């Protein structure tokens, strides 16, 4: 018993603005009415286009299958979607300042730390409910996490899930090698992230290929400390790191940890040593 994705009437949605374009469709921002003509909310409108393979279609209807199942503030909130009509279309709810990496690059260093570690909060939140509702992320990313007005993060882009039974460096060495995706594959990917928002958006390994990302990682190297981070939260990122998948943490443990120093925010003040790249006298 899944719950029941709601098909909505083309006469229910307005396009009103062009935002994203790909080969494949085109996003848009609009407006959905709702039960019936009487709420009206901003919407992203996701496109499907003609000439699509069988593929493509269980890909794309099988990604709102799939948040249609979820019921949780940090997962993007799938409103419903139009099949029986063409083009066909994801409706989720509108996302106003876009992917958080691009959004934490244009807003450099102007969050606080009790800020970014809120938004870190909040992606766990989400993906420890998406794990215990056993699904696996397996492209979990900055840019795949969208941010809205009032600065909440959401899990989005679930094009890869999968239910429990790919940039290089975003995922775990036993998912690279392996292909053995599981929650825990998830944890290193979300160390990463934590890495991204810290940084506010800086590339992972900068210029390293993914052949010498893979290479530093097997000979136990990890991103170094972004700047003005607190000890607590570059601890917790490195366990998120650990090369034995048994000896990271879970997202049960992150939301809980990242709870208690939100709770006593001075422990946030204890900064990990930034490693000084250059010198200057």
């Not at 800020?115 to 795949?144: C, E, F, P, S, T």
């Not at 825990?184 to 993914?210: C, H, K, Q």
Request: aromatic letters at 10%; charged letters at 25%.
């Amino acid at each position: 018993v899944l719950k029941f994705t709601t098909e909505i009437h083309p006469s229910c949605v307005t396009r009103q603005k062009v935002i994203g374009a790909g080969e494949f469709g085109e996003v848009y921002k609009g407006m959905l009415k709702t039960s019936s003509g009487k709420k009206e909310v901003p919407v992203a409108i996701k496109t499907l286009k003609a000439g699509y393979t069988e593929k493509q279609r269980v890909d794309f209807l099988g990604e709102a299958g799939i948040m249609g199942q979820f019921s949780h503030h940090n997962i993007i909130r799938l409103e419903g979607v139009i099949s029986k009509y063409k083009p066909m279309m994801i409706i989720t709810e509108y996302m106003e300042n876009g992917a958080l990496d691009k959004f934490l690059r244009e807003k450099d260093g102007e969050f606080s730390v009790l800020q970014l570690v809120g938004m870190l909060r909040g992606i766990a939140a989400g993906m420890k409910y998406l794990a215990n509702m056993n699904y696996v992320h397996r492209d979990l990313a900055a840019r795949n996490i969208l941010v809205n007005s009032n600065l909440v993060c959401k899990v989005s882009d679930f094009g890869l899930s999968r239910v429990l039974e790919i940039p290089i460096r975003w995922t775990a060495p036993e998912a690279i090698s392996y292909r053995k995706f599981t929650s825990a594959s998830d944890v290193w990917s979300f160390g990463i992230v934590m890495w991204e928002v810290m940084t506010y958006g800086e590339r992972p390994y900068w210029e390293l290929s993914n052949h010498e990302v893979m290479k530093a990682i097997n000979d136990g190297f990890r991103l170094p400390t972004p700047m003005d981070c607190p000890s607590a939260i570059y601890q917790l990122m490195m366990q998120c790191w650990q090369q034995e998948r048994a000896r990271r943490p879970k997202f049960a443990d992150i939301v809980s940890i990242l709870d208690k120093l939100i709770r006593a925010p001075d422990s946030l003040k204890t900064l990990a040593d930034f490693d000084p790249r250059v010198s200057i006298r």
